[PDB]
């Protein structure tokens, strides 16, 4: 189970930090990612962080948002800076696990239930 926190309404130019907190074994996790979906639109990729610390970003947020992780805290953060109205959406985190990492590990994707972020002009 993945739980999320940190949603809010903020003014354009502001900052928020979303948390993805996993009731999972960190050693099972290959990568955690953030997605978002706005009404009337398909899901969008936002950011990705591997077990080994490598990160990747969608073009929309490259250099603007930062993804980071604290595995002892079972937590991955989406650090949303320089926000603009276009970033308004429901944000979802995904944790991918792989069985190679341990006996309890499954080949599975786990998803949080969504965190609303609203950015007004």
Question: How would you explain this protein's 3D organization?
Answer:
The PDB classes it as immune system. The N and C termini lie far apart (35 Å). This protein has strands at residues 2-5, 8-11, 16-22, 29-37, 44-50, 55-57, 65-70, 75-80, 89-97, 108-111, 115-120. The protein is elongated. By secondary structure, the chain is an all-beta fold. Strand 5 (44-50) and strand 6 (55-57) form a beta hairpin. The chain has no helices and eleven strands.
Task: Please identify the oligomeric state.
Answer: monomer
Our count of domains comes out at 1
CATH topology, by name, is Immunoglobulin-like
The SSE order reads EEEEEEEEEEE
Task: Give the CATH class.
Answer: Mainly Beta
**In what range is the share of β-strand residues?**
over 45%
Number of strands: 11
From the coordinates shown, what is the CATH architecture?
Sandwich
Q: Count of DSSP helices?
A: 0
Q: Which structural class best describes the helix and strand composition?
A: mainly beta
**Rg over C-alpha atoms, rounded to the nearest angstrom:** 14 Å
Biggest pleated-sheet summary:
7 strands, mixed
Estimate percent helicity: under 10%
Within CATH, the superfamily carries the name Immunoglobulins
Distance between the termini: 35 Å
- Shape, per Cα inertia axes: elongated
């Amino acid at each position: 189970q993945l739980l999320q926190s940190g949603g809010d309404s903020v003014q354009a130019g502001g900052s928020l930090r979303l948390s993805c907190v996993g009731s999972l074994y960190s050693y099972c996790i290959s990568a955690v990612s953030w997605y978002r979906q706005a009404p009337g639109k398909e899901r969008e990729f936002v950011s990705w962080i591997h077990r080994d610390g490598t990160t990747s970003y969608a073009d929309s947020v490259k250099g603007r948002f930062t993804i980071s992780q604290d595995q002892p805290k079972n937590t991955v953060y989406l650090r949303m800076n320089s926000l603009k109205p276009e970033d308004t959406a429901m944000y979802y985190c995904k944790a991918e696990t792989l069985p190679k990492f341990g006996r309890a590990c499954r080949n599975a994707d786990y998803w949080g239930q969504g965190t609303q972020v609203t950015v007004s002009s």
